[PDB]
Design an enzyme around this catalytic site. Structure first.
Site, PDB file in Angstrom:
ATOM      1  N   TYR A 101     -30.606  31.943  18.864  1.00 32.03           N
ATOM      2  CA  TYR A 101     -30.538  30.857  19.824  1.00 32.03           C
ATOM      3  C   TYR A 101     -31.371  31.178  21.051  1.00 32.03           C
ATOM      4  CZ  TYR A 101     -27.329  33.607  22.678  1.00 32.03           C
ATOM      5  OH  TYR A 101     -26.761  34.583  23.460  1.00 32.03           O
ATOM      6  N   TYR A 161     -19.271  25.844  30.359  1.00 34.87           N
ATOM      7  CA  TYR A 161     -18.508  26.609  31.332  1.00 34.87           C
ATOM      8  C   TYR A 161     -17.897  25.735  32.420  1.00 34.87           C
ATOM      9  CZ  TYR A 161     -20.507  30.690  29.116  1.00 34.87           C
ATOM     10  OH  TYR A 161     -20.856  31.654  28.202  1.00 34.87           O
ATOM     11  N   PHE A 170     -29.583  24.029  23.877  1.00 31.75           N
ATOM     12  CA  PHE A 170     -29.682  25.197  23.016  1.00 31.75           C
ATOM     13  C   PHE A 170     -30.545  24.879  21.809  1.00 31.75           C
ATOM     14  CE2 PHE A 170     -25.769  26.265  25.242  1.00 31.75           C
ATOM     15  CZ  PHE A 170     -25.972  27.598  25.511  1.00 31.75           C
ATOM     16  N   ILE A 218     -18.221  28.831  23.352  1.00 31.67           N
ATOM     17  CA  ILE A 218     -17.817  27.591  23.973  1.00 31.67           C
ATOM     18  C   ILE A 218     -17.639  26.513  22.910  1.00 31.67           C
ATOM     19  CG2 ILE A 218     -18.790  28.101  26.210  1.00 31.67           C
ATOM     20  CD1 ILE A 218     -21.244  26.371  25.293  1.00 31.67           C
ATOM     21  N   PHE A 240     -32.134  30.756  30.092  1.00 33.53           N
ATOM     22  CA  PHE A 240     -31.169  31.715  30.609  1.00 33.53           C
ATOM     23  C   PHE A 240     -30.646  32.690  29.564  1.00 33.53           C
ATOM     24  CE2 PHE A 240     -28.713  28.039  29.242  1.00 33.53           C
ATOM     25  CZ  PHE A 240     -27.707  28.618  28.502  1.00 33.53           C
ATOM     26  N   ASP A 241     -30.923  32.466  28.282  1.00 34.51           N
ATOM     27  CA  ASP A 241     -30.435  33.361  27.241  1.00 34.51           C
ATOM     28  C   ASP A 241     -31.261  33.163  25.981  1.00 34.51           C
ATOM     29  OD1 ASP A 241     -29.059  35.154  25.733  1.00 34.51           O
ATOM     30  OD2 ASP A 241     -27.132  34.103  25.782  1.00 34.51           O
TER      31      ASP A 241
END
Lengths: 387, 107, 820, 375
Positions: free
Chosen positions: B26, B82, B99, B56, B36-37
């Site tokens: 991902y 979140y 994502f 999540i 961010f990831d």
């Protein structure tokens, strides 16, 4: 009022006194027993005097009329007083020595002896190390005093403090005089401000507090740093720093030079900005490297953050903040999100300046100790936006 | 707010089941487009079990709707993400998360 | 843009370098959470790419290297370095195998040293712990200061070490070529980051034996070949690179020391086994042959009767050859130790070609050559190089100073020891950071786990070697110091700080002595902790001095004077916290006074007997500062003790005088009880200070003084009045509702008990008339009340329990003594 | 408990191994004598490749030992509130002090050879700047006793032994050019801290040893506590030996500098400070005499405390004698107008009564001999 006190007062300037023989000529002659003289306080310009209403005090020169301020050193308290003295041309015999000789101070006209007030009980509960000084005809055995030499640096600093206090207070006076009175379409209608004198004093003091150069050898740098810390402490203990802050506040009430002119005129408006920058630089010089002087700002940290946004002396205010945050962890423990956000807004509004990054780094760790609260606040309120 | 778009098709017949570990690559981006990831930066697939609330909701639902070998874009509202609290430092409050998920295999 | 344009765009380079500095600062010193957050902004791929990138400016290169270290390696490296100084050897076959020298034919003295860092290490070091970086995981519902502490982000350590070694070799070859385009623009920018990373990885323990050999060959192949290339030593490098090399060599020398310690422990295991077997056999032979000669059997049995430490000392006392004969041990056992000692001296170089052939010679020659070649301008480098030189020239001394930090454990305690070590590492980490809710919770948890661990109680010597008490101490005092005037935060932390230390003193007398050594340090911090209810540094001091006559006699006049000064301040000044809470304003602080008085009690009175040396001092100091007695007993304008107690009872009855009266804790102070307890503690302390009788019969003038002074201070009539004072008694009324007196706000029997102690120790009961008087006025009524309350409803009442304790402790023994 | 004391063979292996570690450490490692100080000093003194350079000697580049001394001097001169304990400094100071001395009729020639060698070893250091480092560390200590100041004083004594006039002149020149009061302030504070006989401590230790307390773990009979009485006797002797050595050889200049420092803003009279310490020591000795006056025989602990006090007093007397020998008339006058006479009176009292008392028992002949030497 005059007290016998021990502690840091010994190293402080207010403990310092100057001896002035009544004669102008050959006043640098050796002091001799029985010599009438005046005792002056360097930082205040006031002379030790006997006043019937208040006894032993320090009065102004205008009221210092010899009879009240004439004192003599005698080796013994016996009422000899046989012969009045005779002026001698030249240095004269070397009677009184530093450190060794024991002297009793006597008011010539009254004949009274300088002694402690014999503090009442419960003064120990007060924890006062201060014994009020009085003029008593009997006195005590321990009334004798040792004379101790003073460094040229300390003497110079005390006289500097006196002159600077006078000048800055006169300046604050003019500012308050025309604070709420607009000049309108006319003159400021008040005494001219000592703009040039203030500027020159500020420049000279900045050069006087300038840190030693790195090229200098280690020993000389250490000596200069010791002297600088001593001078900083003397000025702080005599209150110069508060005076600088007060001047800065009264100059800040005016946003810009034109706003200042509306009350004081264009002639002072030109030097407004120069004076504010000089004041901030002097404050930074006074506090730099001195943990105590930087810690004093723990109470009024908002004083600096509120002014950070101002454009006239942004760099100077930032340097002040940097110095404070390096020297003191006490400020780091009281930091808040408001302050962190103000500094981040300073980045946003003034541009990408590495000094602000350095300040933020200093906010995190001091002397090998990290503040997790400050770390987390910076991380949360700077990083995620990514702008 | 889980919304799934197919970037590349998978088998179309095998889908994740509860208690079945899903292995994915991902890349995480906020709606404004900031990354961010990414598992590919670490070069290690991310494994998570369905129904254990490890990931999540956005993931829980999206991967379930996805199929083995499938590549998809998942858009997740803050509530499924979140949320108001956010992820300090990483994710701002009230942020929609985008994502790109490749479902390698199920185990 | 390409980040490589920052070579010409200088402002951007500066800003980004300081941004990396900020990234390091926010993650500095244990903020693993911030490290995880950063892993989003600077990813593993970015960092690893930057490591290899040859075109980056040196500032950015070093910043990225340091950022990697900070995010991933800093916490683990610090935790491991904190432990490296300590050597805890498990008794294991691996330990037994360890030898100073590798097996070989060459002679002990000659025997070529094994390669440093290459061997079997059994010393206990807790493992590193890392958590993968993820930002899609569910948010923990646990709130802040309840969530567990996060671990450092994980990075592939084996790949990282391989890359580091390869890049270091590349740097070495490039330096050999002497190119005009160094990586980063300078030899420093090229080498320093790599060497820092390598040192971090070594300390962390990632490198294996072959990797260590590669590093050694990079340093100096010729020396470190086991059984052209130019080494960093001859690469003629600048001062910063020299500093990094010095750190590397410090690591290797530390490993050599560790090997020495482990070999000594192994030999200790084997030699102790042999000695134990021989001692058993000799004792058996003696129990067989005692019949022939009974005289020498006594001298023989001196050994088996002496303490084991003395037995070992005697058995080992054969070095000088002048007293060897007295030692029972045979020549083979003696010669084994002699041979090991010779081998150790050879390993350390004491025992008597140009090329070094050894690490010690290499380091010495390197340092001397560097200093000869240039005048070093780096004080840090000077310090490091001369430290290494000292270590090389003094190997025996370094081992001798490391031995106190050495401890042997059984293999069955390894798991508990490791858990304890992890907790201690957490505590040690808590020193650097400022205390917060999170840190307090972690500290409490670590203390609790340590207390639950058996090893804590079993091995107090190991605890002292580890320095745990000093660490706890420093944490506590650091917390107190910050804003001590405003308020004492983290009182839960301080309470834990006793439970740890204020039990640690009870575990062993040696532990008690160790804590006693810090008495002055505790007392100066104790002054502010008065308000903060619970276990205090004053309790630490009381635990350090309690029940140890040795320590009590060691106690110092200056500490007593400090306590008395605090007590005088309490006696003359009110408590600002109570004033702020709105309590009625009196002039003095009975609660703090009582705390200090009970400390002085524990100091002066030990094991049932007074210590006259401390007691006389306390009396003198107290009478010099009469304010410590209280507003009563002042003298001029001073009410009597009985009047003070009566007024205290009046206050207790009347609200708005006992307290504000306008409490979730239920521990709110009641001023009447506080005053009565202050006076009771004062009287108890004076009674304990009272001389023992044997001194009185001896006629000691000092004893007679002290007794007369105590009598003058406290008149007997007042003691009798206080003893006679009535006490509220539980009763059933208004439908049989049980009416019970509150103790925290009322007069209680222990107050009378203190008076009884004073009466017995100072005045004494020698006359029947006074005996009968006291018993009719005060004692018999109270005994009757206790008997009356000995009923189902009343028997369990706290009031009845207190009365029974008072009776049994004070009255009944006294009547037993006065029976005739 | 003594009967129950477990035989060694019954103990767990690990505890026995620990005990062995301590015993081996004490008997073998601690007793071993390895000397590396002189070798270290020589290796650091030698300069290399200057012979091929032919310009480096004229450049006067510091050799390694010079650099080490300069490093320590830099540490001392660094502005700090307190002097941090530096184990490296203490170790290296001990090494230099050991190297300086490196040590039944002796020939005049041999004696002069030992003197010349000692001079060479002292030169190795004071040529490299060790005297100034000593003075700087003494000033830095700021009147706080510790291992650092003890090592500094030992190094000073080592470089000054025999009354090295070169070191004396270097020290005096440094002090007079720098004009710092910290050195003598620290000296005065250390004198004030220096301890005397304490009867309360004597009695406390006596009761402690009488208790016969045994260590609960295992058993340690009559465990020896830290000696409270005259714990700093060695430091006191070192301080006064240092001050004596500074004046050794009848150095009028340093003798007068001790009395008065003309250049400095303030002056401290070390002679009067020494007299004050002597007076305090005299009072302690007189009290301890009175304590033992009724007792027929002094016991061993007392015989000690007496001997330690008389050694300290001997060093003090020698230092005072060296201050005035030459003669230094100003120092003579200062002592004459000081409180020395009272100390002499008390010492005479004690001498007479102790002589009469100790003559009665022969076991006390050694103490009597030391007392007579002190007189």
């Amino acid at each position: 009022l005059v007290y016998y006190e021990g502690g840091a007062v010994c190293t402080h300037a207010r403990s310092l006194w100057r001896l002035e023989p009544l004669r102008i000529s050959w006043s640098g002659s050796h002091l001799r027993w029985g010599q009438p003289l005046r005792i002056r306080h360097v930082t205040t310009g006031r002379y030790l005097a006997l006043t019937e209403d208040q006894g032993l005090v320090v009065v102004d020169a205008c009221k210092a009329h010899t009879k009240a301020t004439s004192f003599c050193f005698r080796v013994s308290k016996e009422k000899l007083d046989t012969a009045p003295k005779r002026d001698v041309e030249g240095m004269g015999p070397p009677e009184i020595k530093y450190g060794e000789s024991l002297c009793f101070v006597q008011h010539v006209a009254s004949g009274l002896w300088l002694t402690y007030a014999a503090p009442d009980p419960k003064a120990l509960r007060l924890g006062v190390l201060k014994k009020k000084a009085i003029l008593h005809q009997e006195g005590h055995m321990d009334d004798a005093l040792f004379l101790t030499r003073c460094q040229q640096e300390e003497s110079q600093a005390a006289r500097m403090i006196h002159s600077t206090a006078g000048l800055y207070n006169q300046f604050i006076k003019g500012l308050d005089s025309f604070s709420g009175k607009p000049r309108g379409s006319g003159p400021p209608a008040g005494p001219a401000l000592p703009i040039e004198a203030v500027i020159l004093s500020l420049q000279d003091l900045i050069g006087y507090f300038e840190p030693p150069s790195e090229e200098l050898q280690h020993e000389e740098k250490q000596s200069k740093l010791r002297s600088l810390r001593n001078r900083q402490s003397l000025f702080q203990e005599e209150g110069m720093l508060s005076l600088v802050l007060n001047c800065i506040d009264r100059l800040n009430v005016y946003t810009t030079a034109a706003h200042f002119a509306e009350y004081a005129g264009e002639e002072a408006a030109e030097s407004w900005k120069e004076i504010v920058n000089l004041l901030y630089e002097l404050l930074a010089s006074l506090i730099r490297g001195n943990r105590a002087n930087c810690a004093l700002f723990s109470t009024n940290l908002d004083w600096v953050v509120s002014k950070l946004d101002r454009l006239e002396a942004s760099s100077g205010i930032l340097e002040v903040l940097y110095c404070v945050l390096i020297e003191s962890p006490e400020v780091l423990n009281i930091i808040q999100e408001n302050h962190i956000k103000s500094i981040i807004s300073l980045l946003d509004k003034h541009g990408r300046n590495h000094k602000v990054l350095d300040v933020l780094c200093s906010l995190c760790v001091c002397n090998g100790v990290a503040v997790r609260s400050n770390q987390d606040l910076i991380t949360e309120n700077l990083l995620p936006g990514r702008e | 707010g889980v919304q799934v778009e197919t970037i590349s098709p998978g088998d179309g017949r095998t889908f994740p089941k509860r208690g079945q570990t899903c292995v994915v690559h991902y890349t995480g981006m906020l709606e404004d487009g900031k990354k961010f990831d990414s598992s590919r930066d670490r070069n290690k697939p991310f494994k998570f079990m369905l129904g254990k609330q490890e990931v999540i909701r956005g993931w829980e639902e999206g991967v379930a709707q996805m199929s083995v070998g499938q590549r998809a874009k998942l858009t997740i509202s803050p509530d499924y993400a979140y949320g108001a609290t956010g992820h300090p430092g990483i994710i701002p409050p009230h942020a929609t998360l985008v994502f790109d998920v490749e479902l390698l295999k199920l185990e | 843009m390409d980040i490589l344009e920052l070579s010409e765009r200088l402002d951007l380079q500066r800003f980004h370098s300081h941004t990396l500095r900020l990234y390091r600062a926010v993650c500095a010193l244990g903020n693993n959470r911030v490290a995880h957050a950063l892993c989003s902004h600077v990813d593993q791929a970015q960092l690893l790419h930057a490591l290899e990138d040859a075109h980056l400016p040196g500032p950015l290169r070093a910043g990225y290297y340091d950022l990697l270290i900070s995010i991933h390696l800093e916490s683990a490296c610090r935790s491991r370095r904190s432990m490296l100084s300590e050597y805890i050897v498990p008794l294991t076959p691996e330990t037994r195998a360890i030898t100073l020298f590798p097996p070989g034919r060459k002679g002990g003295n000659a025997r070529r040293h094994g390669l440093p860092g290459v061997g079997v290490t059994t010393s206990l070091r807790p493992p590193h712990h890392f958590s993968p970086p993820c930002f899609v995981a569910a948010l923990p519902a646990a709130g802040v200061a309840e969530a567990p502490a996060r671990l450092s982000p994980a990075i592939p350590l084996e790949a990282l070490r391989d890359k580091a070694l390869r890049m270091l070799g590349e740097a070495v070859r490039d330096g050999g070529q002497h190119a005009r385009d160094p990586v980063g623009g300078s030899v420093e920018f090229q080498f320093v980051p790599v060497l820092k990373l390598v040192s971090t990885l070594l300390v962390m323990g990632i490198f294996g034996d072959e990797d260590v050999k590669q590093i050694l060959k990079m340093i100096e192949p010729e020396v470190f070949t086991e059984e052209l290339e130019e080494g960093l030593l001859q690469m003629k490098l600048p001062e910063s690179v020299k500093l990094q090399m010095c750190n590397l060599l410090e690591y290797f020398c530390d490993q050599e020391l560790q090997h020495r310690v482990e070999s000594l422990a192994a030999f200790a295991e084997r030699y102790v086994d042999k000695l134990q077997a021989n001692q058993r056999s000799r004792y058996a032979l003696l129990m067989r042959a005692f019949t022939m000669s009974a005289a020498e059997t006594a001298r023989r049995t001196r050994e088996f009767r002496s303490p084991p430490q003395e037995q070992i000392n005697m058995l080992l006392h054969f070095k000088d050859e002048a007293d060897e004969e007295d030692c029972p041990l045979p020549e083979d056992i003696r010669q084994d130790l002699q041979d090991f000692h010779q081998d150790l001296l050879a390993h350390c170089g004491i025992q008597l070609e140009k090329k070094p052939q050894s690490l010690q010679e290499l380091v010495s020659h390197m340092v001397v050559r560097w200093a000869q070649e240039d005048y070093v301008q780096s004080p840090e480098l000077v310090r490091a190089m001369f430290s290494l030189l000292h270590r090389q020239y003094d190997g025996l001394g370094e081992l001798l100073r490391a031995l106190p930090r050495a401890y042997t454990i059984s293999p069955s305690s390894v798991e508990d020891t490791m858990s304890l070590l992890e907790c201690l590492g957490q505590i040690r980490s808590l020193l650097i950071v400022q205390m917060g809710p999170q840190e307090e919770n972690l500290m409490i948890q670590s203390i609790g786990n340590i207390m639950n661990n058996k090893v804590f109680y079993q091995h107090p010597n190991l605890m002292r070697a580890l320095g745990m008490h000093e660490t706890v101490m420093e944490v506590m005092v650091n917390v107190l110091g910050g804003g001590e005037t405003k308020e004492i935060r983290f009182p839960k932390m301080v309470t834990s700080c006793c439970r740890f230390l204020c039990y640690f003193c009870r575990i062993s007398r040696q532990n008690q002595r160790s804590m006693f050594d810090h008495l002055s340090y505790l007392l100066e911090n104790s002054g502010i902790g008065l308000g903060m209810q619970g276990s205090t540094p004053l309790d630490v001091a009381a635990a350090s001095v309690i029940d140890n006559n040795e320590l009590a006699l060691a106690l110092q006049e200056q500490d007593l004077e400090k306590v008395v000064s605090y007590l005088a301040g309490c006696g003359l000044q009110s408590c600002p916290m109570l004033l702020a809470k709105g309590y009625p304003d009196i002039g003095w602080n009975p609660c703090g006074g009582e705390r200090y008085l009970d400390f002085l009690r524990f100091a002066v009175f030990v094991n049932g007997e007074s210590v006259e040396e401390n007691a006389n001092v306390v009396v003198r100091l107290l009478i010099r500062k009469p304010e410590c007695f209280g507003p009563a007993l002042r003298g001029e304008g001073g009410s009597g003790l009985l009047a003070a107690i009566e007024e205290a009872i009046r206050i207790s009855e009347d609200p708005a005088r006992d307290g504000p009266g306008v409490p979730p804790e239920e521990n709110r102070v009641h001023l009447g009880h506080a005053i009565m307890s202050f006076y009771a503690a004062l009287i108890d302390l004076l009674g304990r200070c009272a001389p023992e009788m044997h001194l009185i019969q001896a006629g000691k003038g000092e004893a007679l003084r002290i007794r007369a002074i105590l009598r003058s201070l406290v008149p007997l009539d007042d003691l009798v009045g206080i003893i006679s004072l009535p006490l509220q008694i539980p009763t059933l009324g208004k439908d049989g509702a049980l009416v019970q007196p509150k103790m925290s706000a009322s007069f209680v029997p222990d107050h009378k008990a203190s008076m009884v102690l004073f009466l017995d120790r100072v005045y004494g009961i020698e006359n029947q008339d006074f005996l009968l008087h006291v018993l009719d006025v005060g004692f018999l009524p109270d005994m009757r009340a206790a008997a009356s309350l000995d009923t189902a409803t009343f028997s369990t009442t706290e009031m009845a329990l207190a009365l029974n304790r008072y009776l049994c402790l004070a009255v009944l023994p006294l009547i037993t003594k006065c029976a005739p | 408990a003594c009967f129950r004391m477990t035989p060694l063979y019954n103990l767990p292996t690990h505890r026995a191994c620990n005990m062995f570690l301590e015993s081996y450490k004490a008997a073998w490692i601690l007793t071993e004598d390895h000397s590396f100080e002189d070798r270290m000093i020589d290796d650091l003194s030698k300069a290399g490749e200057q012979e091929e350079e032919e310009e480096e000697v004229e450049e006067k580049k510091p050799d390694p030992l010079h650099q080490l001394v300069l490093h320590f001097s830099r540490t001392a001169l660094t502005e700090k509130s307190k002097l941090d304990e530096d184990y490296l400094y203490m170790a290296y100071a001990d090494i230099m002090a050991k190297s300086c001395h490196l040590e039944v009729e002796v020939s005049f020639e041999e004696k002069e050879m030992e003197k010349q060698r000692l001079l060479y070893q002292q030169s190795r250091l004071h040529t490299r700047g060790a005297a100034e480092m000593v003075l700087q560390m003494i000033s830095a200590c700021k009147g706080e006793t510790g291992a650092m100041v003890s090592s500094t004083l030992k190094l000073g004594i080592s470089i000054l032994n025999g009354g090295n006039a070169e070191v004396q002149q270097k020290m005096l020149d440094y002090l007079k050019d720098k004009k710092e009061v910290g050195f003598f302030q620290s000296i005065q504070a250390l004198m004030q801290t220096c301890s005397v006989l304490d009867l309360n401590a004597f009695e406390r230790q006596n009761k402690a040893e009488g208790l016969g307390m045994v260590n609960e773990d295992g058993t340690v009979i009559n465990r020896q506590n830290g000696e409270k009485v005259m714990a700093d006797d060695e430091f006191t002797q070192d301080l006064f030996r240092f001050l004596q050595l500074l004046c050794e050889g009848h150095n009028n200049d340093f003798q007068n500098y001790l009395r008065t420092q003309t250049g400095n803003t303030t002056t401290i009279n070390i002679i009067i400070c020494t007299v004050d310490y002597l007076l305090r020591l005299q009072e302690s000795i007189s009290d301890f005499y009175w304590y033992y006056s009724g007792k027929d025989v002094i016991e061993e602990q007392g015989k000690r405390n007496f001997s330690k006090a008389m050694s300290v007093a001997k060093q003090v007397f020698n230092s005072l004698t060296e201050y005035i020998q030459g003669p230094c008339t100003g120092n003579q006058q200062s002592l004459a107008h000081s409180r020395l006479w009272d100390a002499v009176v008390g010492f005479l009292h004690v001498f007479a009564h102790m002589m009469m008392k100790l003559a009665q028992d022969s076991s006390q002949i050694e103490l009597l001999k030391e007392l007579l030497d002190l007189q």
